[PDB]
Design a binder for this molecule. Structure first.
Ligand SMILES: CCOc1nc(NC)nc(NC(=O)NS(=O)(=O)c2ccccc2C(=O)OC)n1
Ligand SMILES: CCOc1nc(NC)nc(NC(=O)NS(=O)(=O)c2ccccc2C(=O)OC)n1
Lengths: 349, 349
């Protein structure tokens, strides 16, 4: 269960750019306190960790955390059980886990001055946003309200502190620069599979349209849908009749068509309502967001694709949250991912 | 050289507190955009990773990154060679690596509003500080000026971008709360050895005085010296006759004397001048900082301690930077750490 044999492991930085302050650096002058004068800063680089089994079988997997998270979520569950990193090294895949730019060991671009500001340039906004425990509780469908759990819960109850401690803010790095870093990683790795989550769902779809080395996508509970430009289908408002889901991302149809060349699976957990739910905003948000994703997958399929929606309850798994890969049944979730990889030969050399 | 057999691996969050916003949370109202209303935020928690070998021998090692760094620096060198994590799991030690609060996967305490501000409470400062590539080049003694290498340098040339990309800012989390998180980890772990670096040198000394489970300290190029309260010796200014080293940390003698109860080694690399060097501020800074540490160790030994200063050149290792554990000879550096552990029985069950 817990044992793991690695041919090699390591980590590295990839992607990013540099920005500079004014003037010249004088090594005779006091270097502390730190100044922007004569300064070169590396910004928006990404952290990558890799673990390779002895004699891997099939393509490397790239696990890409959701919004406000880090590669921790693939390492261990909140109660300390093995994460997908261990499970899939054991399943003989090389496993990459990333901390995207702006998260965890990824770069947070700030300097000497107000957060995110390099002299007169605003690299990222000084004003931040961040979810609360309460917001995240309902966003991840632990239960309909903070403190409550759905009946069928696979959440590791008792480990709420561990769970919410893994979450944090993201600075306003452009999504283009996040996608760019992962495109560079995919170039470095070669043919691979992207395994995405929540906020990284739409970013992974974008990466695949720029990087033919992406041979497959599995997206756990993706947060933003994607459509060809000008072809977003009618999507209803939420039951409060005022709110909307996240504005779907629109890409040129020439790029969207690249999504029809690779197997794509979206995975949803449990307790997404079938009918409008005006008393529970994020439950209703998930209902309409999942609907929008079903239309996105249909558009990919109308273009020759191999896109599918897996609702874990239809596969016999009840009670999953929006983090199925750290829930109590995450070994059974992993088995369904192994099934997808096997079906498309992504577990074969 | 690279194969590793883990009995188990994983990661978890530990330490920290909570802060709360005003008001209450209504699950029926839009959760996004995120708001401080009814919000609970987990802040200042620390990320911990562990890798355990089969049949461990001796005490677990806790590797604690220097200032503006993360546990990455123990995983791999900038040119991709094994870091101390791999080397010491191979040396049959369980190995913990942390991202301290405010760094990497540790929490960065910010909310909805100007960086670090929770309504009118400033949790961390909105104005940040951060080294440049140029300041870090001379701080780490790659050479005397940015872009120039000492002839004898053990730095992995050609991987400068990779190296500097690992560095970043730290918010103004109080050092007390950083020490608190590690004390809690040490309580959770049991008897262990701290391996510290640069800015975590003084913090690790402080942890030892609060945590009898710390059975030894090895500090690579510690940045701040520590003395009993009111017994700071005379320390000269820098060669410019205007700058000072970091103000020594002072602790109550009853706490200081706990440092005499365990083996302590400070490790310094090469190219620290013996004589005043007015032209190169950080070289001179290291000359006086090393001298202050020599007096700190002497004060520990006058309390019955066993505190030593290891200059790597005297061991036949030339050219090390302020990150000896990621330099080209880091295997030989690791051998000297294994020697220390073995001399003191810390590699024995
Ligand atoms: C502050 C403006 O909010 C905002 N607007 C847009 N559309 C313009 N997109 C984003 N990005 C996200 O995906 N949000 S989220 O918080 O990471 C998220 C939401 C829902 C479900 C899951 C997540 C997630 O990844 O949690 C694991 N955020
Ligand atoms: C505004 C600064 O005044 C101030 N005083 C104190 N005294 C406790 N400590 C700090 N912290 C730092 O600046 N650490 S440092 O930059 O990362 C660093 C400096 C020198 C040598 C090494 C490091 C380091 O850790 O290299 C990885 N700063």
């Amino acid at each position: 269960k817990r044992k793991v044999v690695l041919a090699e492991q390591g980590s590295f930085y990839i992607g990013g750019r540099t920005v500079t302050g004014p003037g010249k650096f004088d090594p005779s002058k006091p270097v502390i306190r730190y100044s922007n004068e004569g300064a070169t800063f590396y910004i928006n680089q990404m952290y990558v960790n890799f673990q390779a089994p002895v004699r891997p079988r099939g393509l490397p997997l790239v696990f890409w955390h959701g919004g406000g998270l880090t590669g921790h979520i693939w390492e261990s569950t909140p109660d300390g059980r093995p994460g997908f990193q261990t499970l899939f090294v054991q399943d003989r895949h090389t496993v990459y886990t990333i901390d995207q730019p702006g998260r965890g060991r990824g770069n947070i671009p700030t300097f000497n001055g107000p957060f995110g500001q390099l002299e007169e340039e605003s690299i990222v906004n000084t004003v931040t946003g961040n979810s609360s425990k309460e917001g995240a509780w309902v966003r991840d469908r632990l239960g309909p309200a903070p403190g409550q759990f759905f009946e069928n819960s696979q959440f590791p109850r008792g480990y709420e502190d561990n769970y919410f401690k893994e979450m944090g803010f993201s600075p306003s790095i452009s999504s283009d620069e996040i996608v760019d870093a992962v495109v560079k990683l995919v170039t470095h790795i070669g043919p691979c599979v992207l395994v995405t989550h929540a906020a990284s769902g739409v970013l992974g779809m974008r990466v695949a349209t720029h990087a033919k080395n992406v041979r497959g996508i599995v997206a756990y509970e993706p947060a933003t849908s994607i459509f060809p430009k000008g072809k977003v289908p009618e999507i209803p408002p939420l039951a409060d009749k005022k709110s909307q889901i996240f504005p779907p991302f629109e890409i040129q149809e020439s790029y969207f068509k690249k999504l029809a060349k690779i197997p794509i699976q979206f995975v949803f957990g449990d307790n997404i309502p079938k009918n409008p739910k005006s008393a529970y905003w994020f439950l209703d948000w998930w209902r309409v967001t999942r609907y929008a994703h079903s239309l996105s997958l249909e558009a990919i399929n109308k273009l020759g694709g191999q896109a599918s929606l897996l609702d874990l309850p239809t596969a016999g798994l009840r009670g999953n949250t929006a983090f199925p890969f750290t829930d109590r049944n995450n070994v059974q979730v992993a088995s369904l991912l192994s099934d997808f990889l096997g079906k498309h030969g992504l577990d074969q050399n």
